[PDB]
Structure formats: structure tokens, C-alpha cells
Amino acid sequence: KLLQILNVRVVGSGERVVVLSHGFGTDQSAWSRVLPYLTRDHRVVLYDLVCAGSVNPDHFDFRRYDNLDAYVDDLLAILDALRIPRCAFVGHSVSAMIGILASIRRPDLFAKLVLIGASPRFLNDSDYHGGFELEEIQQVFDAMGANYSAWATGYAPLAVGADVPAAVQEFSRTLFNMRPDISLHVCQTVFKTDLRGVLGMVRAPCVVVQTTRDVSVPASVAAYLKAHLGGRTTVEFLQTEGHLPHLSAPSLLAQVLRRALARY
């Protein structure tokens, strides 16, 4: 079942296992440029989220995946299936949220988290700056429904951030492959998620990767995570911008991953 359905791949080798888990609009191919920096040293597990365009969309149960817990269930089932008792987990965006929840459910299994493009809550609240307002997201949801292709075309370069045409082309490729109803549903699920209250339950050490601008993650979010995450947390800075550094600046991201994954 799950190992086939979610395109699970295990590559490299080592006692140090690391799971790479992609974000919204991409699939595991997003990791392809960083992957060669990890596989000499680590056993690496890749998989696609059930909402990825590279997964048959008829597996997407809208009821089941109404919250991120169901995505955590998939991740845990994959690791249990592979008989992995201990790993480091690298998660981008929605997968950083999944990683946080999964590390709380199973603190035995998650030795270290690396969180990229990460936020505990995207909507603003009283003295909390998430980056988004309700009326704004309502318009986003309408645009995704009215003309998904036009929405995706506009979003891709903004997510990449830096003027890196090859990264825009690549992210667009996978974004256009998400089924639009699934896309909208995931987008809604992420915007209703608020992990602020459970951050202190994370016991794993955490590296939060901050780029110099992310359209979906204000600069203040990383300090917030560092202040509230319950494990030993550091913020590591890349000297370039964007929400998708694994696509736009993979060599630089790989340096941070090699150091973060050295011991755990």
C-alpha cells in the first residue's frame, strides 16, 4: 500500500537516517539537487505527500485529509513499515508542520528536525505576525477555483522569490500537476493549522532555516520558532531569498543540511 502509493524511495546508506519531506506544490523531485550531498553519508528516505501531483489523485480522501494529523499518520506508517527506529527529518513548509506534529507523537523516532520555509501559523493573530489576513486568503481561494492555471502562474515566481528562471519553471511544472481541487483543499488545510500551542511539546533539537525573504514566512517567524520550540533550537541563515531554497539555491542549502545532519 503506502510505500507504493506515496512513491517511497530509500537511497544512500548509513546509520544516520534522514527523511526528506516536500512542501506544497512540489514532490520529492524538489530534493534532487541537494540529494547527492547526503547519500554518501546517510540513508535517505524520500516520499511524496498524498496531495502531490505525482501521486494518483484518486487516493486523496478529502474527509481524511482535513487536517495535518492524517499526513502525520502516513509519515509514521512509512517509517514503521521500513522498520526505522530513529531518524532526522527535513521538512519544507507544510512538511515542517507535519514534522513538528510527528516529533510530538513519536519523540523516540525523531532525533532532529530541520525546518525549511516553516511557520506554525500563517494567519495573523493578536500580536502574532503570520503574514496573511482572512480577506486575502479568501481571494486566494477564489482565484484558485476560478482559474487555477492563472493562479499557479502568478504564484510560482513569487514563491521562488529570486529571479531564477529554471527554479520558476521547475516549481511551475509540479504546481500545474496538482489536481486543482486537491490544491485548494491543501491550501485551506494549511491556513487553518495553528501549531503555536504545541511547539513546547517538541523534544527534538531543531534547525530552522531562514532565507532573507519568504513571501509566506515573515522574518520574525524564525525567532518565534526558536523561542517556543521545546528542544534545542538554532536558526541558520542562507544568504539568498525565497521560499524554495532547495530549488533556487540547492548548493547553499546542502551546506546547512550537511552540518545539521552531522550528529544527532
Swiss-Prot record:
Q: What happens when the gene is disrupted?
A: Increased number of tillers, reduced plant height, and elevated levels of strigolactones.
- Spans through the membrane: none
**Catalytic positions?**
S93 (nucleophile), D214, H243
Q: What is the effect of changing S93A?
A: Weakens interaction with D53 and attenuates strigolactone-induced degradation of D53
- Positions bound to substrate: S93, C187, H243
Q: Which UniProt keywords apply?
A: Cytoplasm, Hydrolase, Nucleus
Q: Which GO terms describe its cellular component?
A: cytoplasm; nucleus
Q: In which tissues is it expressed?
A: Expressed in the parenchyma cells of the root stele and lateral roots, vascular tissues of vein and leaf sheath, ligule base, auricle base and stem base.
Which top EC class is named for this enzyme in its record?
hydrolase
Effect recorded for G99D: In d14; dwarf and high tillering phenotypes
Instruction: Please describe, based on the UniProt annotation, the reported consequence of changing F191A.
Output: Loss of strigolactone-dependent interaction with SLR1
**EC number, UniProt record:** 3.1.-.-
Task: Name the Gene Ontology biological process terms.
Answer: secondary shoot formation; strigolactone biosynthetic process
Subcellular location(s): the record lists: Cytoplasm; Nucleus
Tell me what effect the entry lists for H243A: No effect on strigolactone binding, but decreased enzymatic activity toward strigolactone and loss of interaction with SLR1
Family recorded in the similarity comment: Belongs to the AB hydrolase superfamily.
What is the purpose of this protein?
Involved in strigolactone (SL) signaling pathway. May function downstream of SL synthesis, as a component of hormone signaling or as an enzyme that participates in the conversion of SL to the bioactive form. Strigolactones are hormones that inhibit tillering and shoot branching through the MAX-dependent pathway, contribute to the regulation of shoot architectural response to phosphate-limiting conditions and function as rhizosphere signal that stimulates hyphal branching of arbuscular mycorrhizal fungi and trigger seed germination of root parasitic weeds.
Q: What is this protein called?
A: Strigolactone esterase D14
What is the source species? Oryza sativa subsp. japonica
- Shown chain mapped onto the complete sequence: 55 to 318 of 318
